[PDB]
Design a protein around this ligand. Structure first.
Ligand SMILES: */C(=C(/C#N)C(=O)N1CCC[C@@H](n2nc(-c3ccc(Oc4ccccc4)cc3F)c3c(N)ncnc32)C1)C(C)(C)N1CCN(C2COC2)CC1
Length: 268
């Protein structure tokens, strides 16, 4: 039909995985052989014309630390987005689960995994726009991968897209996004910094004592996240470097990967 198009007849819905961001998610089999997860893009939530075209570029993205996109179902409604099944679910839950007693080595490995994915997205000039622990997925092997990337681009409800919106990710946003709606590679850098904080805080909510509007106010005025207990000074420096007020002074994802690998070597 199209190169990435999947025939819905090749799919079979088996289990409920819950409601995800921008759609219902189900576990199933593709061609009765491969384990897949299917996100059904809620009808009318997206600007379908633009969304279908941008999905083609999205599908061409290929990386080990990006959630593997098998195909799409764009000829019917709701639109399906078919991906690999990530058995350990969302990273936020994986972090919060108290039966998991993490070592900092494992927490730094999670940061590397995402930083590799984000370095790749940066090399393709493809912005995530909503990087967080709730968005990241974990497979059966404990490898973290990035997911829902670029998916906020064409959400029709202004409460999700507007910097002053009620469902906007204020706590993962830099001052230039909150004040001026200015997204770039450096807004992804800021968010990754907050994600590092989330990881090292074992899934704690950033700026938890403040509401979203209170947080928005305090970020613009110079508030930055404190050092988590599990974060060493060197790890804190890395996540803190992501939060320069001036966007151009923030590092690239290449530089952040180099910083993480340096710490990894000394950490051993
Ligand atoms: C996280 C959940 C928990 N516990 C959690 O695990 N998940 C929420 C339910 C759906 C789960 N899930 N989603 C996918 C999946 C993601 C993305 C896509 O499509 C795209 C689109 C663009 C680029 C890449 C991928 C398809 C999918 F199928 C899963 C996969 N692949 N495997 C396994 N599980 C998947 C994720 C938390 C943070 C606790 N949770 C709380 C409730 N939240 C809803 C309330 O508002 C949202 C969801 C987030």
């Amino acid at each position: 039909y199209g190169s990435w198009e999947i025939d819905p007849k090749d799919l079979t819905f088996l289990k409920e995985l819950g409601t995800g961001q921008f759609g219902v998610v189900k576990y199933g089999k593709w061609r009765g052989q491969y384990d897949v997860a299917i996100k059904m893009i809620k009808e009318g939530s997206m600007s379908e014309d633009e969304f279908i075209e941008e999905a083609k570029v999205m599908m061409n993205l290929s990386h080990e630390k990006l959630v593997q996109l098998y195909g799409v179902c764009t000829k019917q409604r709701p639109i399906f987005i078919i991906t690999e099944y990530m058995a350990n679910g969302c990273l936020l839950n994986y972090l919060r689960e108290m039966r998991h007693r993490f070592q900092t080595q494992q927490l730094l490995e999670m940061c590397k995994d995402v930083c590799e994915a984000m370095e790749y997205l940066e090399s393709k000039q493809f912005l995530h726009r909503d990087l967080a622990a709730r968005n990241c997925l974990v497979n059966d092997q404990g490898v973290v991968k990035v997911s829902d990337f670029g998916l906020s681009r064409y959400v029709l409800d202004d409460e999700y897209t507007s910097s002053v919106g009620s469902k906007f990710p204020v706590r993962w946003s830099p001052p230039e996004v909150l004040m001026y709606s200015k997204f770039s590679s450096k807004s992804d850098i800021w968010a990754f910094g907050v994600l590092m904080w989330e990881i090292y805080s074992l899934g704690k909510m950033p700026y938890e004592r403040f509401t979203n509007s209170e947080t928005a106010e305090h970020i613009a005025q110079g508030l930055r996240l404190y050092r988590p207990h599990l974060a060493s000074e060197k790890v804190y420096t890395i996540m803190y470097s992501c939060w320069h007020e001036k966007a151009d002074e923030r590092p690239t994802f290449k530089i952040l990967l180099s910083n993480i690998l340096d710490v990894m070597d000394e950490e051993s």
